[PDB]
Design a binder for this molecule. Structure first.
Ligand SMILES: Nc1ncnc2c1ncn2[C@@H]1O[C@H](COP(=O)(O)OP(=O)(O)O)[C@@H](O)[C@H]1O
Length: 73
């Protein structure tokens, strides 16, 4: 239903991997405040109240955004 993206240091947007985007979307759809995500051996908090990804070790916050997926399932 959705493709979530995160913003890099050059200001460019990157799609989350497919399963991570599913995890984020499912939490967003039910109104969660936040969901934890692990990728690349890192742990991120996805904070829906601020629409940011937060690295739980470094404190870096990055913007996230949601695009609709047109593709019919
Ligand atoms: N969800 C993500 N998936 C893959 N790479 C990411 C993701 N978020 C950030 N990055 C990249 O990984 C590196 C580390 O980013 P981050 O975890 O935010 O820590 P920091 O910037 O504090 O070192 C950067 O190159 C960044 O662009």
């Amino acid at each position: 239903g959705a493709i979530w993206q995160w913003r890099d240091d050059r200001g460019l947007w990157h799609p989350y991997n497919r399963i991570d985007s599913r995890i984020i979307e499912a939490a967003h759809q039910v109104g969660e405040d936040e969901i934890s995500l692990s990728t690349l051996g890192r742990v991120y908090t996805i904070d829906f109240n601020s629409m940011q990804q937060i690295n739980e070790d470094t404190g870096t916050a990055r913007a996230i955004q949601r695009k609709p997926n047109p593709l019919a399932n």
